[PDB]
Design an enzyme around this catalytic site. Structure first.
Site, PDB file in Angstrom:
ATOM      1  N   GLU J   8       0.828  -1.205   0.000  1.00  0.00           N
ATOM      2  CA  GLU J   8       0.000   0.000   0.000  1.00  0.00           C
ATOM      3  C   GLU J   8       0.866   1.262   0.000  1.00  0.00           C
ATOM      4  OE1 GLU J   8      -3.234   0.936  -0.113  1.00  0.00           O
ATOM      5  OE2 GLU J   8      -3.917  -1.083  -0.636  1.00  0.00           O
ATOM      6  N   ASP J   9       1.623   1.423  -1.085  1.00  0.00           N
ATOM      7  CA  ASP J   9       2.449   2.609  -1.299  1.00  0.00           C
ATOM      8  C   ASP J   9       3.462   2.809  -0.177  1.00  0.00           C
ATOM      9  OD1 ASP J   9       1.095   3.213  -3.689  1.00  0.00           O
ATOM     10  OD2 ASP J   9      -0.440   4.350  -2.606  1.00  0.00           O
ATOM     11  N   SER J  10       3.968   1.718   0.389  1.00  0.00           N
ATOM     12  CA  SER J  10       5.031   1.777   1.381  1.00  0.00           C
ATOM     13  C   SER J  10       6.343   1.308   0.762  1.00  0.00           C
ATOM     14  CB  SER J  10       4.672   0.935   2.608  1.00  0.00           C
ATOM     15  OG  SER J  10       5.527   1.235   3.698  1.00  0.00           O
TER      16      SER J  10
END
Ligand SMILES: [Zn+2]
Ligand SMILES: [Zn+2]
Ligand SMILES: [Zn+2]
Ligand SMILES: [Zn+2]
Ligand SMILES: [Zn+2]
Lengths: 167, 48, 64, 252, 98, 98, 44, 48, 48, 134
Positions: J8-10
């Site tokens: 998740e966009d990490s």
């Protein structure tokens, strides 16, 4: 640990006392009271100190702070000291203004103490007052209202002979 | 330089300084809820 | 601002090759040839020299 | 006011905004300290006159590029004088000009009475009278002006080199020390010293020019310069590069 | 190869040099907490003091969310107990306090 | 102008550090002609009467850093890559959005 | 209290009362010299 | 460490809460305040 | 609970200090609230 | 998708690279404080106050400041630290000193004293804090 006392004072005539001594002795628990003869001083640098000698116990000194309920309380720290204190406090710089010996009898209780005495002025002993004085000094660390309340009951028992209040 | 009775900063109305207590309820700043005053109008005044 | 001492990826010593790299570029080596001569085989190390900007040189132009 | 601690100093706290007894830790006051503030991390005639005086003071100060700190000191001085009211009969403009002059003197960058008059509609005589009255009213005093006070401004306005400014300052100070110009005004002495330095340096400025900037007549500059001329080699700094030798300086 | 075990990863990873940027948004400058902190003068409500302890706004949307949850006690805590608890003495006969 | 009243050129770095306004003095030539009705008119010209200061956009033709070589900018502690095009008001670099 | 002139880099002692200004340069921007107190850095 | 939960002292948890008080605010986990039956608040870091 | 005559202002309530507490600015210069200033106005006018 | 910590966009960063200066940065924060003699007797002066001379002060230690009330360069400064010690004369002298951000923990980088456009003395203090990627 520091304790502050609960004391409050009153005086008793000479003829009165003969009844008072029997009154106090019976009312509280004790055996054959002792006549206490002590020679007290006061020392000022303001930090008023009181050193007492008793006629073979060591010189006991005590400080009473400014008073802070039906009682008079001031912070007190009493420390026992060996002999040759008086010259020690001379080298401190403290100066002695007056010294008076006290004579009389003291009776105890569970916590509180009663001492009846007369103040003698020194030049040679002279009776400063014709009537003795009695107080109910109580020593208890972290003073609380509960201890002071117990004194009220006992004072009421002694009210008839002498009525005493703090000053 | 001190609180005055009958003035706007009446000590009765509440506590003035943080290290102080009002004379009415003897409560500190947090305990004292503040007490109302009143002004007598020599002439009746309409309420907006 | 200045050439890093170590390659960020693998930690190879890369801080002592900046002056030699510039010397080779002055000696007309292509960038890849200069990197090969310096011995930077891994592209992670080659990136250090290839993408480095020596801002310290211009920072030294300001009087202390 | 710790209940168990007669006369106990309660330490302030910033985490909770409360005052706490240091020897027991009891919290006296829950959120009483207001850390947000404690930790920095229809107009009346009198007030209208004061506002007009402040506006005039700002105008005069900007005319000669005076700093806002001097402006604020002038405003405070005017407030004190105006409330004192010993100068109520004098014009507010004159009071403001005198206050500006006093503020400059107190801040240590004095401006000549002529300089203040150049920016104020009030005359030099009236400004001086109001200045004396203001000093009496405030029961204060201003340090005596010295020749070195005006050297920076005069030399900068004349566009003289730093070496010439230093030479002029040294000449004026040494002349005052030697008492070659007794009773002479500090502005006149400074103008004469500046003329001497300018004539001894490459950047030469005429008596008319120096008088124009300094507010001093060329004749007064001539008198002061004649008084200091005989001892010019003594007055000049030791390490001064004389474009014109001190012997060949203009004689007048 | 897996770093923990050294075993070849079944899928072949796409790896190469890419230009990344570090934005000014650091967690250090954004982290902040409030627990029994300073309050303002009139509202007696939380306000940041000498730190980032100004608390968090329990907005109308959060109020509606807790109402839907049915957590009446928690909602009362958040809006009254946590924000600015206070008690007053009020007369029963006449509602106005004194 | 220093507190003593001595004018001196203001470098943009000095303005930034000292919270000054990068402004240039503005002067106008003003001719005042008085007709006294006595059949003579007196015409007096005031040369370069100071009327105010205009903030100066950095790197413009009227800025001190105009036509200066990169070495001169470095000596003045100004980045040659700095494009200018902004004003220094109270030491704050202000840019006028089109 | 030693201050370094921002223009000529000259150290000069300055008290709390005298104005902040270079003794010889005349430059009005001053920088405090680095503290004698020694600070430890972990080379991490 | 900044945030705290007020736990009521019980014979079940008297020893654990005493240990937390001994640890104090200095080292986490610990405690920040002690509230007596009187309702008064005591600051542990100020009073060690 | 509501008599029409009470709508006319004959006695004006004065909010407690807590409602309009005095602020401190620029040292110890007590900045009286806008309510304090207005109450001063009504007090002066009422006395006059 | 190594361990799911980049979901998740990490992003998962190399700790060794970070140790080797990867994406390491400086954060310079400048604090400006001016002393103003505005008021009949309300003047502000830079100086290290005393716990008794002033009307009121704080438990924060003022030993960092110098005789001029300014913190010297190269001194580590954390929360509840005084960088500029100011005193405003009470109409005693109230403490008007300034503190730092509690979270902020850096070293005083550069301290300069000058006169602002208003001619009042003021000091600009640049504090340097090193931000390692985390
Ligand atoms: Zn009350
Ligand atoms: Zn590598
Ligand atoms: Zn206590
Ligand atoms: Zn009622
Ligand atoms: Zn210099």
């Amino acid at each position: 640990i520091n304790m502050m006392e609960y004391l409050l004072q009153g005086s008793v005539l000479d003829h009165s006392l003969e009844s008072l001594i029997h009154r106090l002795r019976g009312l509280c628990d004790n055996m054959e009271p002792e006549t206490f003869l002590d020679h007290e001083m006061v020392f000022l640098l303001p930090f008023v100190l009181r050193a007492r000698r008793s006629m073979g116990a060591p010189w006991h000194l005590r400080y009473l702070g400014q008073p802070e309920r039906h009682a008079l309380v001031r912070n007190c720290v009493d420390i026992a000291t060996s002999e040759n204190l008086t010259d020690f406090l001379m080298e401190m710089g403290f100066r002695m203004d007056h010294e008076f010996v006290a004579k009389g009898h003291l009776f105890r209780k569970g916590i509180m103490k009663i001492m009846v005495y007369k103040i003698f002025r020194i030049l040679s002993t002279e009776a400063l007052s014709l009537s003795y004085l009695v107080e109910l000094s109580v020593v208890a660390p972290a003073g609380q209202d509960m201890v002071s309340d117990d004194m009220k009951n006992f004072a009421e028992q002694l009210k008839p002979l002498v009525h005493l209040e703090k000053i | 330089g001190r609180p005055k009775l009958g003035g706007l900063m009446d000590p009765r109305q509440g506590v003035i300084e943080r290290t102080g207590r009002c004379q009415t309820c003897a409560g500190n700043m947090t305990e004292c809820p503040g007490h109302f005053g009143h002004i007598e109008l020599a002439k009746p005044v309409f309420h907006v | 601002m200045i050439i890093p001492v170590r390659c960020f990826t693998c930690g190879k010593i890369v801080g002592n090759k900046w002056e030699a790299y510039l010397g080779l570029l002055q000696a007309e080596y292509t960038e890849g040839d200069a990197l090969d001569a310096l011995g930077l085989k891994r592209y992670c190390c080659r990136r250090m020299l290839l993408a480095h900007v020596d801002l310290i040189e211009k920072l030294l132009n300001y009087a202390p | 006011t710790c209940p168990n601690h007669p006369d106990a100093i309660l330490v302030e706290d910033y985490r909770a905004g409360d005052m706490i007894c240091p020897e027991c830790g009891l919290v006296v006051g829950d959120r009483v300290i207001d850390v947000g503030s404690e930790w920095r991390t229809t107009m009346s005639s009198s007030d209208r006159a004061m506002m007009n005086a402040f506006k005039e003071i700002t105008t005069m100060a900007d005319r000669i590029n005076l700093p806002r700190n001097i402006v604020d000191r002038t405003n405070n001085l005017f407030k004190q004088v105006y409330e004192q009211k010993s100068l109520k009969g004098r014009a507010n403009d004159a009071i403001a000009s005198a206050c500006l002059y006093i503020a400059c003197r107190q801040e240590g960058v004095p401006r000549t009475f002529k300089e203040i008059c150049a920016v104020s509609r009030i005359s030099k005589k009236e400004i001086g009278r109001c200045f004396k009255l203001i000093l009496k009213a405030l029961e204060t005093s201003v340090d005596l002006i010295t020749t070195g006070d005006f050297m920076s401004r005069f030399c900068s306005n004349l566009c003289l080199p730093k070496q010439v400014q230093m030479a002029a300052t040294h000449i004026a100070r040494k002349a005052v020390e030697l008492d070659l110009v007794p009773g002479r005004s500090p502005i006149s002495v400074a103008a004469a010293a500046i003329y001497m330095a300018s004539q001894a340096s490459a950047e030469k400025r005429t008596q008319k020019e120096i008088g124009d900037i300094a507010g001093v007549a060329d004749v007064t500059i001539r008198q002061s310069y004649r008084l200091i001329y005989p001892r010019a080699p003594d007055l000049f700094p030791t390490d001064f590069k004389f474009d014109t030798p001190v012997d060949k300086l203009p004689q007048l | 190869y897996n770093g923990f075990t050294g075993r070849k990863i079944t899928s072949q990873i796409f790896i190469g040099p890419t230009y990344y940027q570090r934005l000014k948004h650091m967690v250090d400058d954004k982290i902040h907490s409030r627990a029994r902190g300073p309050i303002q003068i009139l509202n007696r409500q939380p306000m940041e003091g000498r730190s980032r302890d100004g608390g968090l706004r329990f907005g109308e949307m959060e109020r509606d969310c807790q109402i839907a949850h049915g957590a009446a006690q928690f909602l009362r805590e958040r809006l009254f107990e946590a924000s600015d608890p206070y008690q007053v003495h009020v007369c029963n006969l006449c509602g106005i306090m004194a | 102008w220093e507190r003593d009243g001595a004018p001196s050129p203001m470098m943009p770095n000095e303005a930034r550090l000292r919270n000054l306004t990068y402004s240039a003095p503005l002067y106008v030539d003003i001719t005042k002609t008085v007709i006294k009705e006595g059949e003579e008119q007196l015409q007096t010209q005031h040369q370069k009467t100071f009327i105010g200061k205009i903030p100066i956009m950095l790197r413009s033709t009227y800025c001190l850093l105009n036509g200066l070589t990169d070495r001169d900018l470095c000596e003045l502690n100004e980045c040659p890559l700095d494009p200018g095009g902004y004003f220094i008001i109270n030491g704050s670099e202000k840019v006028l959005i089109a | 209290m030693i201050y370094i002139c921002g223009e000529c880099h000259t150290e000069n002692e300055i008290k709390s009362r005298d104005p902040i200004r270079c003794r010889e340069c005349g430059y009005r921007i001053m920088y405090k010299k680095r503290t004698k107190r020694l600070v430890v850095f972990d080379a991490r | 460490a900044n945030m705290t939960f007020a736990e009521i002292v019980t014979p079940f948890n008297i020893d654990r809460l005493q240990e937390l008080v001994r640890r104090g605010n200095s080292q986490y986990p610990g405690a920040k305040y002690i509230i007596r039956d009187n309702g008064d608040r005591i600051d542990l870091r100020f009073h060690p | 609970y509501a008599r029409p005559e009470w709508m006319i202002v004959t006695v004006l309530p004065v909010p407690p200090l807590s409602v309009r507490p005095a602020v401190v600015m620029q040292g110890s210069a007590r900045n009286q609230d806008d309510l304090t200033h207005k109450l001063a106005d009504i007090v002066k006018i009422n006395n006059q | 998708s190594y361990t799911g910590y980049n979901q998740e966009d990490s992003v998962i960063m190399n700790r060794s690279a970070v140790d080797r200066g990867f994406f390491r940065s400086v954060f310079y924060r400048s604090y400006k404080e001016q002393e103003s003699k505005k008021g009949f007797d309300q003047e502000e002066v830079f100086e290290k106050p005393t716990r008794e001379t002033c009307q009121g002060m704080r438990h924060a230690i003022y030993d960092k400041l110098d005789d001029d009330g300014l913190i010297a360069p190269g001194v580590r400064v954390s929360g509840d630290d005084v960088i500029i010690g100011k005193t405003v004369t009470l109409p005693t002298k109230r403490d008007c000193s300034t503190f730092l951000r509690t979270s902020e923990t850096g070293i005083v980088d550069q301290v300069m004293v000058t006169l602002n456009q208003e001619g009042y003395k003021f000091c600009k203090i640049r504090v340097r804090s090193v931000r390692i990627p985390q």
